[PDB]
Amino acid sequence: HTMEYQHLGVVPVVSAQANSTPLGGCTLSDGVIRAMGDAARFHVDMEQLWQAAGSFLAEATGSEDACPVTGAAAGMAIAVAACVAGTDGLRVQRLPDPGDQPNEIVLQKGHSISYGGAPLAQMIALGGGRAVEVGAVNETPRSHVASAVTRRTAALVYVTSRTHAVHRKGVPLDELVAIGREHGVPVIVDAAGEGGLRRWVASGADLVIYSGPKMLGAPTSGFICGRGDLVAACRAQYSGIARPMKVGKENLLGLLQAVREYTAVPEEQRAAEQLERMTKLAARLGLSARTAQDDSGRTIYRVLLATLAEEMRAGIPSIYLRDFHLGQLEVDPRALSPDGEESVVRRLEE
Amino acid sequence: SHTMEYQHLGVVPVVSAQANSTPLGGCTLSDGVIRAMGDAARFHVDMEQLWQAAGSFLAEATGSEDACPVTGAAAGMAIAVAACVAGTDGLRVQRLPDPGDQPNEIVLQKGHSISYGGAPLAQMIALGGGRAVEVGAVNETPRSHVASAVTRRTAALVYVTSRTHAVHRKGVPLDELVAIGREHGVPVIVDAAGEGGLRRWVASGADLVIYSGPKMLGAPTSGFICGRGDLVAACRAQYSGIARPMKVGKENLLGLLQAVREYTAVPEEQRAAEQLERMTKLAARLDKIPGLSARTAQDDSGRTIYRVLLTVDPSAATLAEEMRAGIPSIYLRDFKLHLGQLEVDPRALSPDGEESVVRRLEELL
Amino acid sequence: APLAQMIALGGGRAVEVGAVNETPRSHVASAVTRRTAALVYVTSRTHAVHRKGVPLDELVAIGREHGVPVIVDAAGEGGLRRWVASGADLVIYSGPKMLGAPTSGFICGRGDLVAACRAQYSGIARPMKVGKENLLGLLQAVREYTAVPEEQRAAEQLERMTKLAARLDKIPGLSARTAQDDSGRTIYRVLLTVDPSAATLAEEMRAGIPSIYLRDFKLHLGQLEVDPRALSPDGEESVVRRLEELL
């Protein structure tokens, strides 16, 4: 028979911590799987595919254009390269050496996150930029970011995630946009796991970065959308530092099909079905189990429950819970199958 | 509820008579490979566990100590270089492309300074924290020159096997680079992207060998680095660093494993025999066209690949542009346009693709 | 001695653009700045590589746009006019290669830059002495070269190799055929196919009583080539006699 996980000794795991990269991202629907199989059967003009894919994702996000990438980590490096080197093919070939181009990338200290143990500054460095962090972890004044922009500044960076980044007393996105529009400096937004496809582009940001597997139900993929001239600069880096960040034709069609399925389901029906499933789940679960919405203010509902964390990950159905400061644990339903939901209750009884 | 297809985007499939080119989407996949990608998409797995299991699989097929999947040969060069520069130290991995205090000079022959679809090999070296030190000239590189360039600041030697993209005229063969690497304790990195042999390149003693999936193995966008167990471990560590944006989906990896499983079941003597008879019959059908002279030609570099060399005499350059602009877009191998010739490569040419070449050529002569 | 070394002797610094298998036109144009003194182009398809590169006429157009001269290495070219006709400012020929001259050569092209070449004989060209005997030999060699049409030199060479290829194909184990130059030039050689060691056969030819040097550019393909450009009629018989005495 054809190769499967069982032939490798790899046992499937249960994910109660959403679509994390160390677990393979997300599982794909039948429609996305069909789209990847149909794409694998033909040769196509990949430049013609990227243009059509850009137009599709542009309409989905209300932006001028879009450029597919492998994911948000690549999207940041490529967006930085686009702002530093532009479309000039020689400068594309020279990166990460910026030559004489402005390459300072300004961000709040509280947004100095890491991509699975890889610093955001490393992605900035891969695109030829030099990260310039301003302010402190607990506070960054607006004027400090404004005073950081000089003739050497290539772009500003903002991280939306309230899970990885600190936003207390920092600089919100609208103030960064006004700063970028004041100095004529692009604003790059890392919206890797955001469910909103339009609100981040609507803020005026020049480039917005989305990760495919996190919320959109796509395979390993992603895209950068925003201003047309800068998106063209993003595509130009595939002759440079983005060339090893290879996006296959199968992954790209899977991402487009996943966006089609994601935009068809109303966001109001996604929360009600998720709350009713988690409210009933909190009743089935000693132990203090309750239903709690996202503490950062999102339409995501989990079950608010250290030694038990290591125990659930080692059972016959390896269950990975959400461990985001001791206190209590969380059960994220974004990647929880109906079988995986009953498997959680069956193992927790032990 | 119709799924997304190429036609929905306005993209029409093309006919490749120039093998599995990246700009044309790599290669088409068999039903078995397609099935493997779909099955891998239906479960979450420990990706660290999957990378170990896949590593042992690819190491066995290539006869090496271990292997590390990658997105392709371009990523494989950057990761292999990073492995020799930063090693397994997590902070060092996080700080690339800055090499810090580690030796980072990467020695290669001038003739091997190629580019991966625009992106030079020296650029991939720089992404991995290295600095390219090119020795010799395109038409000559003495062995002594390469050995005199290896110092305490040298992190790796690089060798490129492709006789299509690189140049080997009066250069330094692989076995001599291995001997130089062994004398100085410097690893040897081999770009064997489109090689058909899975074992001979590891068998040279090279420490890291790089294969691209879509080229010969019929895999989806993917690849792997195989070789010495300690340096393969250093490759996996780069996925916490410069390899993190070079993501390999679980579907692409399982497709690659199924592609290798199917590739090792068909002997190379059977693939060449069927290809020789398929091009001999195709060359006869084309030679009958008025003005065109077609003959079966073995690969100039010496490989067991057979194409149809088309001799034009009535414009060979204009004929290739006419073939790409037809209703079925057909891409011929125009490496011999300066000689006034074209080539029909079968490596990506379906049986129906052969008829398209004959039909389009007949409708234009 | 690399071309980049010759560049450094002339006070320049080599700026190599692109890759061996590809160099886009835009890359070369973006590398030309106010600090660029010249563009260099090498015609030889034997020693240089031109796969997906920048043709000479495009380098000329780039040079004209930036006011930067173009230097052409046409060392072994047979055409005396076509390379100047491209608009290149300086074109370089080597005497002994095709013109039958003694050790010598010349640079031709734009009058102002040719004058600057002569001035270097008070500088880095002073050790590169050209004897009055070598120069007159070169002039007489060009006089004799321009009197024989290229269509007559090729015809006699084609018939000489066709008859030689037949005499070699009759040798046991050796397959000989007349082959035009792979790069497309009007030069004809005899491609020798060995099947019984092609590498050992060339070493055997160089170690014979008459030392014979074959063209071993196709040793990796298991082939050898008999080039006639320096092969006297008596030299042909030596090749047949030595090959017969070893098969």
| Contact map slice: A 258-297 vs B, CB within 8 A | 260
Query: Which of chain A's residues have a Cβ under 8 Å away from the Cβ of C18?
Result: 93
Closest CA to C26 of A82, A91, A99: A91
A6-24: string of b/e by CB count within 10 Å (b at 16+)?
ebbebebbbbbbbbbbebb
Complete DSSP assignment for C48-71 = S--TT---HHHHHHHHHHHT--EE
- Under DSSP, is residue A25 helix (H, G, I), strand (E, B) or coil? coil
CB contact at 8 A, A56 and A259: yes
Calculate the alpha carbon distances from B232 to B8, B52, B55, B78, B208 in Å.
Answer: 42, 11, 9, 13, 7
CB contact at 8 A, C71 and C38: yes
A91 is annotated as contributing to ligand binding? no
- Taking CB atoms and an 8 Å limit, are A97 and B126 in contact across chains? yes
| B231/B208 Cα distance (integer angstroms) | 7
Closest CA to A120 of A52, A73, A174: A73
Complete DSSP assignment for A244-298 = TS---HHHHHHHHHHHHHHHHS-HHHHHHHHHHHHHHHHHH-----EEEEETTTE
B231-244: string of b/e by CB count within 10 Å (b at 16+)?
bbbbbbbbbbbbbb
Any CB–CB contact under 8 A between C19 and chain B? yes
From the candidates A1, A3, A123, A339, which should be mutated to test the interface with B, based on the most B CB atoms within 10 A? A3
CB contact at 8 A, B353 and B14: no
* Strand A153-159 to A104-108 pairing: parallel
- Under DSSP, is residue B326 helix (H, G, I), strand (E, B) or coil? coil
Query: A89 Cβ partners below 8 Å, 6+ apart?
Result: A236, A239, B118, C24, C26, C27, C30
A298 is annotated as contributing to ligand binding? yes
- What H or E segment, with its residue span, contains residue C179? strand C174-180
- Under DSSP, is residue A218 helix (H, G, I), strand (E, B) or coil? coil
| C92/C14 Cα distance (integer angstroms) | 18
Of B4, B123, B261, the CB nearest to A253: B4
Query: Which of chain B's residues have a Cβ under 8 Å away from the Cβ of A74?
Result: 245-247
In angstroms, this model's resolution equals 2.4
CB contact at 8 A, B347 and B338: no
| Contact map slice: C 40-69 vs B, CB within 8 A | 45-51
- What H or E segment, with its residue span, contains residue A83? helix A72-85
| C88/C58 Cα distance (integer angstroms) | 11
C9: its two tokens: 């002797």
φ/ψ of B134, rounded to 5, equals -85, 130
Closest CA to B209 of B226, B196, B232, B195: B226
- Report which residue type is found at A75: G
Closest CA to B206 of B179, B170, B224: B179
Query: Which of chain A's residues have a Cβ under 8 Å away from the Cβ of C24?
Result: 89
| A22/A124 Cα distance (integer angstroms) | 22
What is the distance in angstroms between the Cα of C50 and the nearest Cα belonging to chain B?
A: 10
> Residue A298's Cα: distance from chain center in Å?
16
C46 is annotated as contributing to ligand binding? yes
* Strand A330-331 to B105-109 pairing: unpaired
Phi-psi region of B118 (alpha: psi -120 to 50; beta: other; left: phi over 0): left
φ/ψ of A247, rounded to 5, equals -110, 115
* Count helices and strands in chain B by DSSP H and E runs: 14, 14
- Report which residue type is found at A116: G
Strand ranges (E), B85-198: 105-109, 115-116, 119-120, 131-135, 154-160, 188-191
- Under DSSP, is residue B27 helix (H, G, I), strand (E, B) or coil? coil
- Taking CB atoms and an 8 Å limit, are C24 and A89 in contact across chains? yes
Search chain C and give the residue with CA nearest A93. C18
* Count helices and strands in chain C by DSSP H and E runs: 10, 7
A235 is annotated as contributing to ligand binding? no
- Under DSSP, is residue B293 helix (H, G, I), strand (E, B) or coil? strand
What is the distance in angstroms between the Cα of B350 and the nearest Cα belonging to chain A?
A: 10
Which residues in chain B are followed by a discontinuity, with C-to-N distance exceeding 2.5 angstroms? Answer: 314
Of B114, B163, B300, the CB nearest to C19: B114
- Taking CB atoms and an 8 Å limit, are B37 and A36 in contact across chains? yes
- Taking CB atoms and an 8 Å limit, are C27 and A91 in contact across chains? no
| C203/C213 Cα distance (integer angstroms) | 9
CB contact at 8 A, C38 and C12: yes
Residue C94, beta-bridge partner list: C105
φ/ψ of B342, rounded to 5, equals -135, 165
Of C18, C47, C50, the CB nearest to B139: C47
- What H or E segment, with its residue span, contains residue B276? helix B268-287
